[PDB]
Design a protein around this ligand. Structure first.
Ligand SMILES: Nc1ncnc2c1ncn2[C@@H]1O[C@H](COP(=O)(O)OP(=O)(O)NP(=O)(O)O)[C@@H](O)[C@H]1O
Ligand SMILES: Nc1ncnc2c1ncn2[C@@H]1O[C@H](COP(=O)(O)OP(=O)(O)NP(=O)(O)O)[C@@H](O)[C@H]1O
Ligand SMILES: N[C@H](Cc1cccc(C(F)(F)F)c1)C(=O)O
Ligand SMILES: N[C@H](Cc1cccc(C(F)(F)F)c1)C(=O)O
Ligand SMILES: [Mg+2]
Ligand SMILES: [Mg+2]
Ligand SMILES: [Mg+2]
Ligand SMILES: [Mg+2]
Lengths: 259, 259
């Protein structure tokens, strides 16, 4: 009989498409040696052929989708003024107020893309024709309890359109084309809306105007959404724990690096 | 005569390829209105045609170069254990010890890619054939004095090869092909080596083994280098201040967003 500690070790080496059973009559050492051989082989094939990181490749694939749909690619600061958090309405009564990674006295690691996207919408409205379509992909940070669906360091896609054409129908059409392009099953549940894969939230989306817009100098309708890239990878590759998709020293494209 | 404050404002709106002179006999308001029209036009052309961010596009171009040369694309944590800094030999007698952005009690924003690349080399040596070639591109953080060549939030390319073929000649060949591919003039000065554009350091490169390797479980020869992406963009686009190439709310592809 395998110990719990031994089964934990084998599950680190198990990939979703393996057809091995750990309740066999086979000893630990031989199940471990079999899985180690498979995972080394998996890494050798990546190294010999594609050599691309899942998280990097997904960001590039999403970038192409949105650029091709007419959205401007934004790269904005990850380390942001702490004042942005309060100005987002994130006060002490919100869960999120307790999740902020503070840096020095007046800064923090951004937990979301919305402040920077608001600022870009306001500034670009002085220069670009209506409607204004922008998106950003990059690191975001939140303190979280341990859990199979949460990382403290993750990657968010955020997109926003401002001006004409900002209807819930158009928002759902973007989400639907996007996820059908990536090959990810979803349901939209609902002006706020969540994009669900079973019980897992892939995105929260919204339709403006909302009262918060005024604090950011925004006074036009808008639609937008935010997606976690590691949650998309978790669903696409059927990972049991989102740690397999993270920026990590422990996994490469979902393969354990502790071999 | 323009005030100093007015000339500062015009220089925000000036792009390197403009052929306007601010020592003309033209009033500020009309020089400002001319430049504002040009910069709005520049943003409209980006939005209508390419829509890609300089920093994102450069990262994708560098990724293709290194993947095509046989290097594995790594995406590792930006928020790293504080212990990694000391283990890199960064003690109190180094400038860098005073430049760390600490987060909570045991973490920091990485100021370099070397700790994570060392860890990946050690782990992948159990699985991949010799030689092991890896690279990473992503955010790095250092407290800096104000200066036209430094950002507190920047983007570093780091690459490393371990095992056979780790000669200074091979290292210089990688650097030379890389920068000739990007179209960036350089000189290599020198086992340590710096890649210079005039007085600007584009890269520091190195040849192992070195004594530090043992602390990271490394005992094979290696070559590698680290490049700042914003410095590469600064040189390529002839920006006067690296702020024009940064993750920013103030500039988009070097164009002022304050129009
Ligand atoms: N800690 C996290 N790790 C990974 N992805 C995350 C994390 N927090 C948020 N996301 C993703 O970012 C998207 C937009 O952020 P947000 O709607 O604020 O998440 P959320 O409401 O906190 N979801 P949840 O924490 O699971 O109830 C979410 O739909 C997730 O896909
Ligand atoms: N603050 C910064 N802003 C932008 N790029 C940077 C910064 N610090 C380092 N880099 C880049 O990262 C590369 C590798 O890091 P490193 O060799 O440690 O820089 P460095 O020695 O501090 N150069 P410098 O600070 O100008 O004397 C450098 O060659 C630069 O191109
Ligand atoms: N669901 C969002 C993610 C998000 C990204 C970009 C824009 C927006 C917008 F303001 F459009 F809703 C949201 C969050 O975490 O705030
Ligand atoms: N010049 C380096 C940048 C760097 C990146 C990746 C690897 C390495 C290596 F360990 F190869 F030298 C260095 C620094 O800042 O440490
Ligand atoms: Mg949450
Ligand atoms: Mg949500
Ligand atoms: Mg320095
Ligand atoms: Mg240096």
């Amino acid at each position: 009989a395998l110990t719990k500690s031994q089964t934990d070790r084998l599950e680190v080496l198990l990939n979703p498409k393996d057809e091995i059973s750990l309740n066999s009559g086979k000893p630990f050492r031989e199940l471990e040696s079999e899985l180690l051989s498979r995972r080394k082989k998996d890494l050798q094939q990546i190294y010999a052929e594609e050599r691309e990181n899942y998280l990097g490749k997904l960001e590039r694939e999403i970038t192409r989708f949105f650029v091709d749909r007419g959205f401007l690619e934004i790269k904005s600061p990850i380390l942001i003024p702490l004042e942005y958090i309060e100005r987002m309405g994130i006060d002490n009564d919100t869960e999120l107020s307790k999740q902020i990674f503070r840096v020095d006295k007046n800064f923090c690691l951004r937990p979301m893309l919305a402040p920077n996207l608001y600022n870009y919408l306001r500034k670009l409205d002085r220069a670009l024709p209506d409607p204004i379509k922008i998106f950003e992909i990059g690191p975001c940070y939140r303190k979280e309890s341990d859990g199979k669906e949460h990382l403290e360091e993750f990657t968010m896609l955020g997109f926003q359109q401002m001006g004409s054409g900002c209807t819930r129908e158009n928002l759902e059409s973007i989400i639907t084309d996007f996820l059908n392009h990536l090959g990810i099953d979803f349901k939209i549940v609902g002006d706020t809306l969540d994009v669900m894969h079973g019980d897992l939230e892939l995105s929260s989306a919204g339709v403006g105007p909302i009262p918060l817009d005024r604090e950011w100098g925004i006074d036009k309708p808008w639609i937008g959404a935010g997606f976690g890239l590691e949650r998309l990878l978790k669903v696409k590759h059927d990972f049991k724990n989102i740690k397999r998709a993270a920026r990590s020293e422990s996994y490469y494209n979902g393969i354990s690096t502790n071999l």
